[PDB]
Amino acid sequence: NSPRIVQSNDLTEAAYSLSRDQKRMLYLFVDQIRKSHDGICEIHVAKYAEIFGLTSAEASKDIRQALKSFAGKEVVFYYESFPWFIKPAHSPSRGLYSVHINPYLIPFFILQNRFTQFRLSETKEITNPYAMRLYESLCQYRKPDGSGIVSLKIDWIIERYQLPQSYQRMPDFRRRFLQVCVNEINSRTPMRLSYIEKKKGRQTTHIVFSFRDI
DNA sequence: ACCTGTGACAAATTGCCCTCAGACCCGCCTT
DNA sequence: GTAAGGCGGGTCTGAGGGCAATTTGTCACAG
Ligand SMILES: [Mg+2]
Ligand SMILES: [Mg+2]
Ligand SMILES: [Mg+2]
Ligand SMILES: [Mg+2]
Ligand SMILES: [Mg+2]
């Protein structure tokens, strides 16, 4: 009976760079917003700890540092850029944080034909944020029986997930992004994932993912 | 030229550990 | 002896300060 996150495909496919801790918080904002609004959300240290199996101390550390690092981050919807926050976060009470999400993001969070959905228990053990991005993109194509198949273009992966510059060399892309993230998904989610490479000449251009549910 | 994979090293991140003051509660002293 | 109402101290939290072991980001070399 875990909380069911649903979100517009525009967010699944947006270009941005967030840490694991920031994305964990972002799922709860999207849930809060969705039960309704004006963008103001809230996070309690003690429930976050319980949700993600952390101590109170380490939850506090994760929230605090995540919140400070939102400053200056933008989100781009394909070409329109917005800041996530329009005011700094603050604590009215011990164990409580209050946050001001950009009100212009609300429509981008929630069209009834174009959406992505997963239960939070599916992603809360993933560590690498890129494996988080990848698992959201695959869910976007999932069927009721839990299977799907999709071809993603490599340049689009690099742009939207904002992979670091040295992964433009394909052997580094293979070793440090693709193999690690397919292993995490196979190990940390109920999804079972395989893939093959599409070539054009000597260049590899797309990755084709197939998956089913356990 | 282009392509691949591997070995090295640096920078970042993980779950831990400790300390100490804030909020909350309630047994006991006082009247 | 009882009973009602305030206070000091004890427990529960979370806001800080750290750590070493692993993972991620980068580039030389060779095939
Ligand atoms: Mg990072
Ligand atoms: Mg942490
Ligand atoms: Mg060529
Ligand atoms: Mg060598
Ligand atoms: Mg050569």
Q: Nearest 5°: phi and psi at A191?
A: -90, 145
Closest among A176, A185, A178, A184 to A204, alpha carbons compared: A178
Q: Do A100 and A129 reside in the same domain of the chain?
A: no
Task: Provide the domain count of chain A.
Answer: 2
Q: Do A12 and A109 reside in the same domain of the chain?
A: yes
Of the candidates A124, A154, A174, which is a domain's last residue? A124
Question: Which nucleotide is at minimal CA–C1' distance from A164?
Answer: C25
Question: Which nucleotide is at minimal CA–C1' distance from A55?
Answer: C14
- Contact assessment for residue A94 and residue A56, using Cβ atoms and an 8 Å cutoff: no
Q: Do A63 and A11 reside in the same domain of the chain?
A: yes
Of the candidates A102, A124, A146, which is a domain's last residue? A124
Parent domain of A112: 1-124
Closest among A44, A195, A185 to A118, alpha carbons compared: A185
Measured in angstroms, the resolution is 2.6
Q: Do A93 and A165 reside in the same domain of the chain?
A: no
Q: Do A91 and A183 reside in the same domain of the chain?
A: no
Q: Do A59 and A102 reside in the same domain of the chain?
A: yes
Tell me which residue has tokens 């944020």: A129
Q: Is the CB of A203 under 7 A from strand B?
A: yes
Q: Do A109 and A6 reside in the same domain of the chain?
A: yes
Helices (H), chain A: 9-12, 20-34, 45-51, 56-68, 106-109, 129-139, 154-161, 170-173, 179-188
Q: Do A13 and A82 reside in the same domain of the chain?
A: yes
CA A29 to chain centre: 12
Q: Do A191 and A146 reside in the same domain of the chain?
A: yes
Tell me which residue has tokens 């293979």: A174
Q: Do A54 and A141 reside in the same domain of the chain?
A: no
Q: Do A103 and A33 reside in the same domain of the chain?
A: yes
Q: Do A114 and A135 reside in the same domain of the chain?
A: no
Of the candidates A124, A157, A172, which is a domain's last residue? A124
Which residues are registered as beta bridge partners of A1?
none
CA of A171 to C1' of B3 (A): 10
